[PDB]
Amino acid sequence: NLCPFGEVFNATRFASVYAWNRKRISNCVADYSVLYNSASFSTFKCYGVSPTKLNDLCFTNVYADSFVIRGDEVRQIAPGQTGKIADYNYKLPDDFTGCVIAWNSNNLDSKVGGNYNYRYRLFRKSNLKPFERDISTEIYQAGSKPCNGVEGFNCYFPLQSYGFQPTNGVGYQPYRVVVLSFELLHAPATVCGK
Amino acid sequence: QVQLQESGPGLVKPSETLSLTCTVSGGSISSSNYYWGWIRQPPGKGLEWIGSIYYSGSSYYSPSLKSRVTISVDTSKSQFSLKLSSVTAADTAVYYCASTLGATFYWGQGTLVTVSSASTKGPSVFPLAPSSKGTAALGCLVKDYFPEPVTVSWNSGALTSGVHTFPAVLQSSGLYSLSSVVTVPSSSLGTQTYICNVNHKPSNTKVDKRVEPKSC
Amino acid sequence: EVQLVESGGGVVQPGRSLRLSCAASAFTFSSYDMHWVRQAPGKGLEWVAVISYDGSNKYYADSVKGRFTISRDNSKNTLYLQMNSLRAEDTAVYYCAKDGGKLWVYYFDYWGQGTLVTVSSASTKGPSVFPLAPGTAALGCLVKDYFPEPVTVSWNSGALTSGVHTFPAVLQSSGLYSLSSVVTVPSSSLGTQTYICNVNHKPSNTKVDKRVEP
Amino acid sequence: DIQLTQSPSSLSASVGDKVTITCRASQGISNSLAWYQQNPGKAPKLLLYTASTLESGVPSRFSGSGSGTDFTLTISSLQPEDFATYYCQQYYDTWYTFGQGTKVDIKRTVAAPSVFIFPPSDEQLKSGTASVVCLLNNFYPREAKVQWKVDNALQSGNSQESVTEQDSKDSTYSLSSTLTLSKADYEKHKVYACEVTHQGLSSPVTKSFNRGE
Amino acid sequence: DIQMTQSPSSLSASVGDRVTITCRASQSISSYLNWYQQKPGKAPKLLIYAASSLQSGVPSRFSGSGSGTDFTLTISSLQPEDFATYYCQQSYSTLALTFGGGTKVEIKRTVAAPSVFIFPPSDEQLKSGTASVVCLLNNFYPREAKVQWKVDNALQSGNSQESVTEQDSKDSTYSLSSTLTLSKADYEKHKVYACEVTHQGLSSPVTKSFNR
Ligand SMILES: *[C@@H]1O[C@H](CO)[C@@H](O)[C@H](O)[C@H]1NC(C)=O
Structure with a gap:
């Protein structure tokens, strides 16, 4: 039967970038060329593979990662990028083999009074390793004295609200992203494009 | 995007209390891991943190000002306010409201607050006559006025090339003094009429001064 | 033996449209992806767009996205590039390239000879040629104020080959082009040898021969 | 009370040049430092925090390094919109402190007044x-x-x-x-x-x- | 985008010399680095693909090497028809293909006064x-x-x-x-x-x- 890409792209609600959702896709047939060509995608860049070539290749598994960021941060969802998102929320390896798809979602994820349900990890002591998901809410020590739960001036809650308003500039508007990872192990392949 | 709009008088008499209010329209003043602070900047000087406040957690002030500073928060109207007591001319500065944390992430546009006890005074315009001793310079001195600003043009806007109108300095008298100059060819001093157009709207003062070379 | 032939280039005013073609030969055209790559005057290479083997997938660079359109006709073995809303920054030589296809990624193994697209509003004006009057000596002609590129300059109807230096054109502030061409000759055969520079402007159909004497 | 000292007080460079501003603290402040840009008359804008992390939306030509007491802000290829005054600030203790600022100037030839x-x-x-x-x-x-x-x-x-x-x-x-x-x-x-x-x-x-003459 | 920096911008050499051109990437591009040759007025021609693979018909004097961020094109014995401009292009970002600035190989002659x-x-x-x-x-x-x-x-x-x-x-x-x-x-x-x-x-x- 077919692979369920709709459940990712057409999902009504998306996850925050620090708590990005991953859908493991296996044991199915996938339809790509008709799926991608829609141009209802503001950002569409692939690394290590051609989007027209996927209808020929088979992979052991395919991962569809999904989250929401703001416009000025779409440039960070890429291999070898640095910044608040790529270092503290979602990081791709330097040899990332897959595609990054993004479309403006201002009509879905921004509210007149502002939507603060989309958060991101602002402070973290060390960078995330590739494909790491940190959902920890432990108070961040940013001074000398430890925090031990107590929040304050050298003790910050590591997550921060986005605040999407429909009237904000495109840089401050919400964008939904889908990252398709194509994994090739020395195992029998289960996902082939057709 | 967090939007910070600040309001309050830009003129406070000395020993009085400076008061400013920042209204938040980008993030709920309650539903964000954001401290809410004030940073000032004296003219031509650096930046000085004043204080910050949490939605309930606590407040934190600059010890150099802690005795004079009060920061309050209003959630029903989404505002946090600043009160500086016994202001002096030292407190003449641009005041910003900021969504602070580790860093100050978002910034209001900034309200210049001038501390002076002077009322409104129209300026006096004196000529800076070109002297005798290829290109010569002439101008106007706009002295002893309050408050800001004044506008100076030359020949009703027909002369723009080579004009430098300098920013006003605050004299010890609490009054501002400003000069505007222009370099022209020395050969035109006897044939071209030069007039500076000073306009000080706070005092409804419009003055046209003809600048002529000084006769022996 | 892989051939690619472009056509459809020329002059175009800003905001107008222009369509390019690329006739392929001597390979399975309906199986390879195809590309377009342009090169501004004196600059490097810039990938423009790519189209799949079947023409169902199209991907464009950000500098031309929502402005150019790539398409192909496999029955005719031709590749198309509809260029709308052309800006002056689009002035470049446009190449079409076949995808190598031996990798998981794109790469160009064969290129077309390329066709020029000059985006400017200036009307096709003819050149105004001025002479340059002179231990050897030098002399030449000044091809000034002409639009667009190019102009071909020769000496004595191509008979004088050694010692000639024709300089690349420069886009002056007047939207027109200016070009210099010189030739160094022995100072002995000056009044005995006659020198005539041959300037031709095909876009405006102007052929001007001018004598050069000290 | 932490004291921030920036170097140099004024810097002059050209478009495309590499620019480095230095900021030093009287005490160890780990990586808890932020960089700011202020164009004349406008409000400051955050460039980096934690010495190294670029704020989202900031052009990638900006980069920061350092820890403890010595810090560095660097613009790889200076662009015309980058000429401004630059401040550093620590958020390590309570009494926050700013540097005195570094004004980036356009390098032209020396002209006598x-x-x-x-x-x-x-x-x-x-x-x-x-x-x-x-x-x-x-x-x-x-x-x-x-x-x-x-x-x-x-x-x-x-x-x-x-x-x-x-x-x-x-x-x-x-x-x-x-x-x-x-x-x-x-x-x-x-x-x-x-x-x-x-x-x-x-x-x-x-x-x-x-x-009188 | 991925910037490709070539070094040197221009070099002068003679026939038979050993020429090496350097190509640096702003980030890792694995082995997806391709080399091209372009004559003035002519179309580019593919020399090396996938950093080291020689395109069919290209003389064996051309060779490419490297991985990650540093890459090198090498002409063992330079020939008179090899004087041209050489570009490197990355294909790691397949939908954002970028070229290097180019390295123009010129003929080394003695200093000549104008x-x-x-x-x-x-x-x-x-x-x-x-x-x-x-x-x-x-x-x-x-x-x-x-x-x-x-x-x-x-x-x-x-x-x-x-x-x-x-x-x-x-x-x-x-x-x-x-x-x-x-x-x-x-x-x-x-x-x-x-x-x-x-x-x-x-x-x-x-x-x-x-x-x-
Ligand atoms: C997403 O939803 C649209 C209808 O809203 C449907 O036509 C499309 O096929 C769906 N996409 C997938 C991948 O199922």
Whole structure:
């Protein structure tokens, strides 16, 4: 039967970038060329593979990662990028083999009074390793004295609200992203494009 | 995007209390891991943190000002306010409201607050006559006025090339003094009429001064 | 033996449209992806767009996205590039390239000879040629104020080959082009040898021969 | 109380150059530092925090490094919109502190100022105050010293300076120094000069006048 | 985008030399680095794909190596038909393919001094309203040369245009032409028209002039 890409792209609600959702896709047939060509995608860049070539290749598994960021941060969802998102929320390896798809979602994820349900990890002591998901809410020590739960001036809650308003500039508007990872192990392949 | 709009008088008499209010329209003043602070900047000087406040957690002030500073928060109207007591001319500065944390992430546009006890005074315009001793310079001195600003043009806007109108300095008298100059060819001093157009709207003062070379 | 032939280039005013073609030969055209790559005057290479083997997938660079359109006709073995809303920054030589296809990624193994697209509003004006009057000596002609590129300059109807230096054109502030061409000759055969520079402007159909004497 | 010290106080560079600003703290502050950009008259804008993390939306040409007490901000290829004043700030203790700021300047060739002096008008002398103005027209760099001499006596604490923003065309500055005296103190002396020392002047230039000539 | 920085921008060598060009990437591109050759006026031609794989028909003297961020193209024995510009292009970002700046391989010859000639604007042109003062630098090497216009000892900044030919097929030398364009009103305002030339094969600024 077919692979369920709709459940990712057409999902009504998306996850925050620090708590990005991953859908493991296996044991199915996938339809790509008709799926991608829609141009209802503001950002569409692939690394290590051609989007027209996927209808020929088979992979052991395919991962569809999904989250929401703001416009000025779409440039960070890429291999070898640095910044608040790529270092503290979602990081791709330097040899990332897959595609990054993004479309403006201002009509879905921004509210007149502002939507603060989309958060991101602002402070973290060390960078995330590739494909790491940190959902920890432990108070961040940013001074000398430890925090031990107590929040304050050298003790910050590591997550921060986005605040999407429909009237904000495109840089401050919400964008939904889908990252398709194509994994090739020395195992029998289960996902082939057709 | 967090939007910070600040309001309050830009003129406070000395020993009085400076008061400013920042209204938040980008993030709920309650539903964000954001401290809410004030940073000032004296003219031509650096930046000085004043204080910050949490939605309930606590407040934190600059010890150099802690005795004079009060920061309050209003959630029903989404505002946090600043009160500086016994202001002096030292407190003449641009005041910003900021969504602070580790860093100050978002910034209001900034309200210049001038501390002076002077009322409104129209300026006096004196000529800076070109002297005798290829290109010569002439101008106007706009002295002893309050408050800001004044506008100076030359020949009703027909002369723009080579004009430098300098920013006003605050004299010890609490009054501002400003000069505007222009370099022209020395050969035109006897044939071209030069007039500076000073306009000080706070005092409804419009003055046209003809600048002529000084006769022996 | 892989051939690619472009056509459809020329002059175009800003905001107008222009369509390019690329006739392929001597390979399975309906199986390879195809590309377009342009090169501004004196600059490097810039990938423009790519189209799949079947023409169902199209991907464009950000500098031309929502402005150019790539398409192909496999029955005719031709590749198309509809260029709308052309800006002056689009002035470049446009190449079409076949995808190598031996990798998981794109790469160009064969290129077309390329066709020029000059985006400017200036009307096709003819050149105004001025002479340059002179231990050897030098002399030449000044091809000034002409639009667009190019102009071909020769000496004595191509008979004088050694010692000639024709300089690349420069886009002056007047939207027109200016070009210099010189030739160094022995100072002995000056009044005995006659020198005539041959300037031709095909876009405006102007052929001007001018004598050069000290 | 942490003290931030930036280096250099003023820097001049060209478009495309690599620029480095240094910030040093009186105490160890780990990586808890932020960099800011402020264009003239506008509010500051955050560039980096935690010494190394770029704020979202900031161009990638900006980069930061350091820990403990020494920090560095770097612009890889300077672009025309990058000319401004730059501040560093620590958030390590309670009493937050800023650096004094580093103004990035456009490097043009050295230009000597055209010096003009203006006596007080007879119309101002009727009010009781005398204002002598000294003009330095179209010069570079900004560093220039104006020395007031009244009867060969160097004056200080009765004058004020004012500098124009760098001109958008020829990239030069201009300075005006206003020496203020009472009418009674003005008529006590004869020679009024302003000595100007600048890099583009092999020797200090002096424009002067004698009162009543 | 992924920037590709080539080094050096220009090199001069002779037939039989061993030439190596460097290509750096702003981030890791695995082995997806391709080399191309372009003649002036001609289309690019593929030499190396996937950093090290030789395209069919390309002579074996070409070879490529590298991985990650540093890559190298190597011509073991340079041949006369190999003088051209060489580009590297990354294919890691398949939908954002980017090229390097290019490395132009030129013919190494000895330093050659330029012959400077100056030409006044013709009488046929001055009646149209434009005046163009032209200065020529003839047959020199290397390409680096500074032409400074001085009109009444005043540097004419922002008022001229330069143009350089390619390396001559005989002596491998360059030629430069600077065209100072001013209106006739600007022409009679001054008297002295000079052309200053600074070159490696010279020792002092050279000035060629004439009187009306
Ligand atoms: C997403 O939803 C649209 C209808 O809203 C449907 O036509 C499309 O096929 C869906 N996409 C997938 C991948 O199922």
